[PDB]
C-alpha cells in the first residue's frame, strides 16, 4: 500500500530529469511515508490518490508509470517540460484519471485517436499551451463524463468536430489560439447546453454566430475575439441570466448593439470593438455590475447615455474611433473607480467631467480628436494616479491647472493644438517621471523654466508655436536622455550653450522661427544621433562649423539669419542650397569664386 505505492512513484521519478530537485522528497532516507512527499496525496487507507507536480521543472516523456499508482484519480504536470509526442499506449493504464493537467509543456504530435476510450473517467482535461499538431480526434464526441476541456494555445488544425456537441456534459470548452482551417462554428456546438464557458478566440471562425447559440442559457464567458464573424451580435445574449463576459472584439461584427444591453444587470466586461457597428450606445443602462465597455473603432453615432453613469464599478471606458456626439455625462466618474478612459477620434463636446478622476483611480485620460470646450478642471490638479493624459486637438482654453505639471508619476503630458494660455510653473519640477511633453500649438507664455532640467528621464520636449520668450535655459542641455527638442516659432532669445556634449541621445533640434542670436556650437556637429536640425529664421551669425559635416541630416535648414564665411563643402551643391538662403553675409565657394 505505502510500499507499492513508493516504489511506482520512485519509477516515475526514474523516468525523468529534474534539474530544480523539486522531488528530493520521494528519495530522501527511504522512511517518511509517501503520503507527505511533495506533491502527492493519499486517501485514508494511504493509497496515493493525486500527485501534483506543477511548475516542478521535470523534463521527459510522459510518465506512464503514474497511471500503475491504483487509485491514482488527480494527475497534474501543469507548467513543466514534458516533452516528445503522446502515444496510445501512453495512457492505456489511466482509466481511473478523473482529471489530468498537461498544460504549458512541451508536447508535439497528434493526439492520440484513442485517449477517449482510455480515458472514460475524465472530468477535466487539459492540455493546453503545447505544440500539439493535426485534428482534434472526432472520437473525443464518445467523453460521457467530461466537464471542462482546454486544448487552447496548440497548433491543431482542420476544424472543430461537430461530434464535441455530443459530450453534454461539458460546462467548459476552450480551443482558442489553435491553426483551424476557415470554418464556421459547429452548429452541434448549440447541443451543449450546460456550457458556461466558451473560449474560441483565434480560431479562424467565419459566418455567422450560429443560431443553435441560443439554447447555450447558461454561459457565464463567451470569448469570441480574433475570428471574422459576420452578422448581428445577437440579442440572446442580453437574456443571459448570469453572463459576466462578453468578448467579440476584432471581428466583423454589423448591426447594433442589442437595445436590451441595458438590462444585463451581471455583466461584468464587453467588448465589441474593432468590429462594423452602426447605431447608437443602447440607453437606459442598469448595468450594475460593469467593470469594463471597450467599444472602439466601430462606427457608432449618437451620445454617451446618463446611465453610464449607474455602473458604479466602471473601471475602463474605451468608446475611441466612432461616430459619437453630445456632451460627456457631467457626473461621469464621481461615482465610478475610473482607471482608463480613451474617447479619442470622436465628436464629443462640451466641458470635460470635472470629477472624472473623483475617486483618484484616473490613469488614462485620452481625449484626442473631439471638440471638448472650457477649461481643464482644477479637479484634475489633484490627479495624482494619473500617468497619460492626452488632450490633443480639442476647443480647450484657460490656464491649466497649477498641480496638474507636477503630478508625481504623470509620463506622456500632450496638450498640443488647444488655446491654452499661462506660463509654465515652476512646480513642474514635482513631475519626476515625466517622458513626453507635448504643449505645441497652444497660447503659453513666459520663459521655459529651468526646472525641466531637473527630470533626467524626459526623452521629448516639444513647445512650437506658443508665445515662449527669454532664454533656452542652460539646464536642457544636461538631459541626457532628450530625444526631441522642438521650440519653434515662438519668441525665444538669447545664445545656445556651447557645451552640448550631455545631448547624448539628441535626435532632434528644431528652434526654427524665434529671435536667437550667437553662433552655431561646435559641438552641434559631435552629437552622435542628431539626423534634424533646423535653426532658420533667427539671428545666428558668425561663420557655420566645420563639424556639422560629420552628421547625417535629413534635414539641415539655417535660412534666414545673418551667417557669414563660406558654406561648409560637403554641402556646397545646388540641391542644399535652400538650406543656407537668406544669410546675406554668406557665400558658396565653386569654381574659385565666391557666389551669392
Ligand atoms: C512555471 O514554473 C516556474 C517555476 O518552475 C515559475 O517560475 C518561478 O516563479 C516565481 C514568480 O512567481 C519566481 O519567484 C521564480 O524565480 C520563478 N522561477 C524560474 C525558474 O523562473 C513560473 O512562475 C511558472 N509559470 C506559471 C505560469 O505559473
Ligand atoms: C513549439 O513551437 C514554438 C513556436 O514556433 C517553437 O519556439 C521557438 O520559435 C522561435 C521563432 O518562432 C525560434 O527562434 C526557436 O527556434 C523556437 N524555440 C526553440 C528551438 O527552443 C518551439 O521550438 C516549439 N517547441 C518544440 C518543443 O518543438
Ligand atoms: C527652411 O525654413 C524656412 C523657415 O524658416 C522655410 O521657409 C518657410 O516655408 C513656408 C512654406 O512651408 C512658408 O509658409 C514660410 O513663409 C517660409 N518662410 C520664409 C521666411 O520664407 C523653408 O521652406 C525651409 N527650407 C527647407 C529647404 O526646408
Ligand atoms: C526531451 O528533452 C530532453 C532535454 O531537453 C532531450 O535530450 C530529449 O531528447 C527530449 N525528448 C524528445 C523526444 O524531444
Ligand atoms: C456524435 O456527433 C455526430 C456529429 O454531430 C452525430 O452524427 C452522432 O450521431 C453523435 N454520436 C453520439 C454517440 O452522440
Ligand atoms: C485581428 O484579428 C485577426 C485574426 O482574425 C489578426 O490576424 C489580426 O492581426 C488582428 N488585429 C488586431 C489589431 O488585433
Ligand atoms: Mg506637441
Same mark, same amino acid.
Given at each position: 500500500?505505502?510500499?507499492?505505492?513508493?516504489?511506482?512513484?520512485?519509477?516515475?521519478?526514474?523516468?525523468?530529469?529534474?534539474?530544480?530537485?523539486?522531488?528530493?522528497?520521494?528519495?530522501?532516507?527511504?522512511?517518511?511515508?509517501?503520503?507527505?512527499?511533495?506533491?502527492?496525496?493519499?486517501?485514508?487507507?494511504?493509497?496515493?490518490?493525486?500527485?501534483?507536480?506543477?511548475?516542478?521543472?521535470?523534463?521527459?516523456?510522459?510518465?506512464?508509470?503514474?497511471?500503475?499508482?491504483?487509485?491514482?484519480?488527480?494527475?497534474?504536470?501543469?507548467?513543466?517540460?514534458?516533452?516528445?509526442?503522446?502515444?496510445?499506449?501512453?495512457?492505456?493504464?489511466?482509466?481511473?484519471?478523473?482529471?489530468?493537467?498537461?498544460?504549458?509543456?512541451?508536447?508535439?504530435?497528434?493526439?492520440?485517436?484513442?485517449?477517449?476510450?482510455?480515458?472514460?473517467?475524465?472530468?477535466?482535461?487539459?492540455?493546453?499551451?503545447?505544440?500539439?499538431?493535426?485534428?482534434?480526434?472526432?472520437?473525443?464526441?464518445?467523453?460521457?463524463?467530461?466537464?471542462?476541456?482546454?486544448?487552447?494555445?496548440?497548433?491543431?488544425?482542420?476544424?472543430?468536430?461537430?461530434?464535441?456537441?455530443?459530450?453534454?456534459?461539458?460546462?467548459?470548452?476552450?480551443?482558442?489560439?489553435?491553426?483551424?482551417?476557415?470554418?464556421?462554428?459547429?452548429?452541434?456546438?448549440?447541443?451543449?447546453?450546460?456550457?458556461?464557458?466558451?473560449?474560441?478566440?483565434?480560431?479562424?471562425?467565419?459566418?455567422?454566430?450560429?443560431?443553435?447559440?441560443?439554447?447555450?442559457?447558461?454561459?457565464?464567458?463567451?470569448?469570441?475575439?480574433?475570428?471574422?464573424?459576420?452578422?448581428?451580435?445577437?440579442?440572446?445574449?442580453?437574456?443571459?441570466?448570469?453572463?459576466?463576459?462578453?468578448?467579440?472584439?476584432?471581428?466583423?461584427?454589423?448591426?447594433?448593439?442589442?437595445?436590451?444591453?441595458?438590462?444585463?444587470?451581471?455583466?461584468?466586461?464587453?467588448?465589441?470593438?474593432?468590429?462594423?457597428?452602426?447605431?447608437?450606445?443602447?440607453?437606459?443602462?442598469?448595468?450594475?455590475?460593469?467593470?469594463?465597455?471597450?467599444?472602439?473603432?466601430?462606427?457608432?453615432?449618437?451620445?454617451?447615455?446618463?446611465?453610464?453613469?449607474?455602473?458604479?464599478?466602471?473601471?475602463?471606458?474605451?468608446?475611441?474611433?466612432?461616430?459619437?456626439?453630445?456632451?460627456?455625462?457631467?457626473?461621469?466618474?464621481?461615482?465610478?473607480?475610473?482607471?482608463?478612459?480613451?474617447?479619442?477620434?470622436?465628436?464629443?463636446?462640451?466641458?470635460?467631467?470635472?470629477?472624472?478622476?473623483?475617486?483618484?483611480?484616473?490613469?488614462?485620460?485620452?481625449?484626442?480628436?473631439?471638440?471638448?470646450?472650457?477649461?481643464?478642471?482644477?479637479?484634475?490638479?489633484?490627479?495624482?494616479?494619473?500617468?497619460?493624459?492626452?488632450?490633443?486637438?480639442?476647443?480647450?482654453?484657460?490656464?491649466?491647472?497649477?498641480?496638474?505639471?507636477?503630478?508625481?508619476?504623470?509620463?506622456?503630458?500632450?496638450?498640443?493644438?488647444?488655446?491654452?494660455?499661462?506660463?509654465?510653473?515652476?512646480?513642474?519640477?514635482?513631475?519626476?517621471?515625466?517622458?513626453?511633453?507635448?504643449?505645441?500649438?497652444?497660447?503659453?507664455?513666459?520663459?521655459?523654466?529651468?526646472?525641466?532640467?531637473?527630470?533626467?528621464?524626459?526623452?521629448?520636449?516639444?513647445?512650437?508655436?506658443?508665445?515662449?520668450?527669454?532664454?533656452?535655459?542652460?539646464?536642457?542641455?544636461? %538631459?541626457?536622455? $532628450?530625444?526631441?527638442? +522642438? #521650440? @519653434?516659432? =515662438? !519668441?525665444?532669445?538669447? /545664445?545656445? *550653450?556651447? &557645451?552640448?556634449?550631455?545631448?547624448?541621445?539628441?535626435?532632434?533640434?528644431?528652434?526654427?522661427?524665434?529671435?536667437?542670436?550667437?553662433?552655431?556650437?561646435?559641438?552641434?556637429?559631435? %552629437?552622435?544621433? $542628431?539626423?534634424?536640425? +533646423? #535653426? @532658420?529664421? =533667427? !539671428?545666428?551669425?558668425? /561663420?557655420? *562649423?566645420? &563639424?556639422?559635416?560629420?552628421?547625417?541630416?535629413?534635414?539641415?535648414?539655417?535660412?534666414?539669419?545673418?551667417?557669414?564665411?563660406?558654406?561648409?563643402?560637403?554641402?556646397?551643391?545646388?540641391?542644399?542650397?535652400?538650406?543656407?538662403?537668406?544669410?546675406?553675409?554668406?557665400?558658396?565657394?565653386?569654381?574659385?569664386?565666391?557666389?551669392?
Amino acid at each position: 500500500s505505502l510500499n507499492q505505492d513508493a516504489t511506482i512513484l520512485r519509477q516515475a521519478k526514474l523516468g525523468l530529469s529534474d534539474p530544480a530537485q523539486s522531488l528530493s522528497s520521494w528519495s530522501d532516507n527511504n522512511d517518511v511515508t509517501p503520503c507527505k512527499w511533495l506533491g502527492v496525496s493519499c486517501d485514508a487507507t494511504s493509497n496515493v490518490v493525486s500527485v501534483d507536480l506543477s511548475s516542478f521543472m521535470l523534463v521527459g516523456p510522459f510518465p506512464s508509470i503514474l497511471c500503475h499508482l491504483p487509485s491514482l484519480h488527480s494527475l497534474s504536470l501543469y507548467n513543466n517540460s514534458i516533452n516528445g509526442s503522446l502515444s496510445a499506449d501512453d495512457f492505456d493504464t489511466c482509466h481511473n484519471l478523473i482529471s489530468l493537467d498537461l498544460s504549458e509543456n512541451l508536447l508535439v504530435g497528434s493526439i492520440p485517436k484513442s485517449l477517449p476510450f482510455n480515458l472514460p473517467n475524465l472530468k477535466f482535461l487539459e492540455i493546453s499551451g503545447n505544440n500539439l499538431s493535426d485534428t482534434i480526434p472526432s472520437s473525443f464526441g464518445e467523453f460521457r463524463k467530461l466537464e471542462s476541456l482546454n486544448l487552447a494555445g496548440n497548433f491543431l488544425s482542420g476544424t472543430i468536430p461537430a461530434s464535441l456537441g455530443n459530450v453534454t456534459t461539458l460546462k467548459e470548452l476552450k480551443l482558442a489560439y489553435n491553426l483551424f482551417s476557415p470554418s464556421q462554428i459547429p452548429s452541434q456546438l448549440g447541443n451543449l447546453t450546460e456550457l458556461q464557458v466558451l473560449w474560441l478566440a483565434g480560431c479562424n471562425l467565419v459566418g455567422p454566430i450560429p443560431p443553435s447559440l441560443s439554447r447555450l442559457t447558461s454561459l457565464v464567458n463567451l470569448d469570441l475575439t480574433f475570428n471574422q464573424l459576420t452578422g448581428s451580435i445577437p440579442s440572446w445574449i442580453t437574456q443571459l441570466k448570469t453572463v459576466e463576459q462578453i468578448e467579440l472584439f476584432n471581428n466583423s461584427f454589423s448591426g447594433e448593439l442589442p437595445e436590451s444591453m441595458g438590462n444585463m444587470t451581471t455583466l461584468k466586461r464587453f467588448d465589441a470593438s474593432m468590429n462594423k457597428l452602426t447605431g447608437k450606445i443602447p440607453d437606459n443602462l442598469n448595468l450594475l455590475n460593469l467593470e469594463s465597455l471597450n467599444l472602439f473603432e466601430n462606427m457608432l453615432e449618437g451620445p454617451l447615455p446618463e446611465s453610464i453613469t449607474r455602473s458604479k464599478t466602471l473601471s475602463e471606458l474605451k468608446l475611441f474611433n466612432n461616430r459619437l456626439t453630445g456632451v460627456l455625462p457631467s457626473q461621469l466618474g464621481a461615482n465610478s473607480p475610473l482607471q482608463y478612459v480613451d474617447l479619442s477620434y470622436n465628436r464629443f463636446s462640451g466641458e470635460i467631467p470635472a470629477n472624472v478622476c473623483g475617486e483618484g483611480k484616473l490613469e488614462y485620460l485620452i481625449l484626442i480628436d473631439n471638440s471638448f470646450s472650457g477649461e481643464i478642471s482644477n479637479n484634475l490638479g489633484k490627479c495624482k494616479s494619473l500617468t497619460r493624459v492626452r488632450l490633443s486637438n480639442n476647443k480647450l482654453s484657460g490656464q491649466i491647472p497649477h498641480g496638474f505639471w507636477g503630478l508625481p508619476r504623470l509620463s506622456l503630458l500632450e496638450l498640443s493644438d488647444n488655446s491654452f494660455t499661462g506660463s509654465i510653473p515652476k512646480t513642474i519640477i514635482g513631475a519626476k517621471n515625466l517622458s513626453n511633453l507635448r504643449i505645441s500649438k497652444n497660447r503659453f507664455s513666459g520663459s521655459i523654466p529651468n526646472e525641466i532640467g531637473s527630470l533626467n528621464g524626459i526623452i521629448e520636449i516639444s513647445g512650437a508655436e506658443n508665445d515662449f520668450s527669454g532664454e533656452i535655459p542652460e539646464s536642457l542641455v544636461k %538631459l541626457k536622455q $532628450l530625444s526631441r527638442l +522642438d #521650440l @519653434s516659432k =515662438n !519668441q525665444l532669445s538669447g /545664445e545656445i *550653450p556651447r &557645451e552640448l556634449r550631455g545631448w547624448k541621445n539628441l535626435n532632434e533640434l528644431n528652434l526654427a522661427n524665434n529671435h536667437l542670436s550667437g553662433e552655431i556650437p561646435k559641438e552641434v556637429g559631435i %552629437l552622435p544621433v $542628431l539626423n534634424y536640425l +533646423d #535653426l @532658420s529664421s =533667427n !539671428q545666428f551669425s558668425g /561663420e557655420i *562649423p566645420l &563639424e556639422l559635416q560629420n552628421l547625417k541630416l535629413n534635414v539641415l535648414n539655417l535660412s534666414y539669419n545673418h551667417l557669414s564665411g563660406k558654406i561648409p563643402p560637403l554641402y556646397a551643391n545646388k540641391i542644399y542650397a535652400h538650406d543656407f538662403i537668406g544669410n546675406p553675409g554668406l557665400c558658396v565657394d565653386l569654381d574659385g569664386l565666391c557666389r551669392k
